[PDB]
Paper text:
Here, we report the identification of a third system involved in Um2552 formation, consisting of a methyltransferase of the SPOUT (SpoU-TrmD) superfamily encoded by the ttc1712 open reading frame of Thermus thermophilus, herein renamed RlmR. The RlmR overall structure consists of N-terminal (1–96) and C-terminal (∼105–260) domains (NTD and CTD) joined by a linker.
To this end, a 59-mer RNA corresponding to the T. thermophilus 23S rRNA A-loop, centered on U2552, was designed (U2552 59-mer RNA). We next attempted the crystallization in the presence of SAH. A clear electron density was observed for the A-loop, H90 and H92 of the RNA. Following RNA binding, a significant inward pivotal motion of the L30-like domains occurs and leads to a narrowing of the groove intended to accommodate the RNA. The interaction of RlmR with the RNA triggers a pivotal movement of the A-loop around an axis formed by nucleotides 2551 and 2557. Moreover, the formation of the complex leads to a different orientation of U2552 and C2556 compared to the 70S ribosome structure. In the herein described crystal structure, the A-loop fits optimally in the central groove formed at the interface between the two protomers and creates extensive Van der Waals contacts with the enzyme. Most importantly, the target hydroxyl group of U2552 is positioned at 2.8 Å of the catalytic R128′ guanidino group (motif I), a catalytic residue identified in TrmH, and at 4.6 Å of SAH sulphur.
Numbering used by the authors:
A (entry chain B): 1 to 210, 212 to 260
B (entry chain A): 0 to 260
The structure:
RNA sequence: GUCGCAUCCGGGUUGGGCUGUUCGCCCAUUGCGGC
């Protein structure tokens, strides 16, 4: 039963999931690492194949829930992993397919809108921040891949439960308009400090790639806000900016007043 | 004054070795990659020993050398020396700076960060970039990844060279803090106080722990207050650099007119 | 998993760790194919 050779045909099929085209073709993707597998399961994703290395714990096998369990050697593990030093627990899950059509927001939502194409590592970090602050919705560009290994790793698995939706620009604009959601453009040259916006009644922050925001979006915004920069640096990391904006809104919703 | 073409030239291997912390210690030199970062190291007063120019360098780059040796690298030799998938066209070999807390004085209400056991150079660089944005008066790096790693330099966009950032032994951080009579505020996910409810308008030192294990218990006890940033989702903790930025900007908000919660 | 070819002392061509994972990262230390 053990799969020992990196050349075994099953290892070949599992390592091919590293490529987005194969993930699309098969409807499957790899989740590497015990914590990320736990989070994918707790999020309700369908585990198809559990992969266990030689150092897996007894409890790891109990995660399978009726999926096929494969025991791989270190050498077979190394061909599937995205890491120089592989995890001992990985899962092959079915790709989730979520549409914004159903989504209904409450009266004072906290929304992040990510415009443009961000690097996978930065995106994963943004989504962790969004999860921490309890964002009700994150919108990203139509072709964004939420199930790359960097997004999964840098999100610490937060990507699985987070309401994040890749959508066309017009679909995003329409959704926001139909919610009558105030748009707040975050830009280093914003006319107001970000503490001066009022986010107690619901906000959609607009954020560009580490890049910048498109002009028509900045102009449509009710307000453009800047994070003060007191040294020589001109800008902060996008994930950091996303966290600063979201936690500011949380502060106000916790009783804080606009500056 | 030399043109190097072979990636296997002896100089090139010497230069790529500077990516190892161990070679930087052995030699006393380090590599600064990227035109902006070289500008910042120069502006900060660091000694440039060797300027490296790639094929797409521009004429003004050569005038940065100020009497250092200037080496011309082909695209292939440049690839070996670069720490990047896509190499920069301007790089400098500088002498490692000598900085001590001996000559540091703080004003009445300084804003300080103490980083304990951080291991990811990208995290350190993002923190330094936030400290720069927020105007921190001092950053103590206690026993973590090395301050002059390529990713610290790159992710701080060179702010590492001008920021008042100092690597210290953990026990020296404790002594410097006691010496300065600075209130210590321990950031930890289980902290009893929401971070917005601390008053940071007086002197304050925020304490941040390691990515994996967090803050040691002894440091939590030293703190006057343990503060937490609320977590509302599935994640149990935030990234250490995001945490640092959130703390720095809450203090800035308060110092800019805002009231504690 | 296994098998050469190197190479270094027959014997070795490493251990670990990681809440940013990417020409992945960190820390002790002491290669290159094929199937
Ligand atoms: N100090 C700051 N104030 C406001 N938004 C900021 C910021 N630093 C970064 N951001 C946000 O982070 C994104 C990526 S950072 C790129 C900044 C770029 N020079 C620009 O002019 O936008 C930006 O699009 C912006 O939305
Ligand atoms: N929600 C939060 N509140 C306060 N500090 C936090 C935080 N998330 C991360 N940090 C900071 O980031 C550092 C690394 S996070 C380490 C997490 C570890 N599981 C633990 O229990 O601490 C922590 O030591 C702390 O200084």
């Amino acid at each position: 039963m053990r799969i020992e050779s990196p050349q075994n045909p099953r290892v070949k099929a599992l390592a091919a999931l590293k490529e987005r085209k194969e993930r699309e073709r098969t409807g499957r993707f790899l989740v590497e690492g015990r914590r990320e597998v736990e989070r994918a399961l707790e999020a309700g994703l369908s585990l198809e194949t559990l992969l266990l290395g030689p150092k897996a714990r007894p409890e790891d096998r109990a995660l399978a829930g009726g999926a096929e369990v494969l025991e791989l050697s270190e050498r077979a593990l190394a061909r599937v992993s995205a890491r120089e030093n592989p995890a001992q627990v990985l899962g092959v899950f079915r790709l989730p397919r979520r549409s914004l059509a159903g989504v209904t927001l409450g009266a004072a939502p906290l929304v992040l809108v990510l415009l443009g194409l961000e690097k996978p590592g930065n995106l994963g970090a943004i989504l962790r921040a969004a999860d921490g602050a309890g964002a009700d919705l994150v919108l990203v560009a139509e072709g964004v891949d939420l199930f790359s290994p960097q997004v999964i790793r840098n999100s610490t698995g937060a990507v699985f439960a987070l309401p994040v939706y890749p959508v066309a620009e017009e679909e995003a604009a329409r959704f926001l308009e139909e919610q009558n959601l105030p748009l707040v453009a975050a830009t280093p040259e914003g006319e107001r400090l970000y503490w001066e916006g009022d986010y107690r009644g619901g906000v959609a922050f607009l954020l560009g790639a580490e890049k910048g925001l498109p002009e028509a979006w900045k102009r449509r915004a009710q307000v453009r806000v800047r994070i003060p920069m007191r040294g020589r640096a001109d800008s902060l990391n996008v994930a950091v900016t996303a966290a600063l904006l979201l936690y500011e809104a949380l502060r106000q919703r916790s009783g804080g007043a606009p500056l």
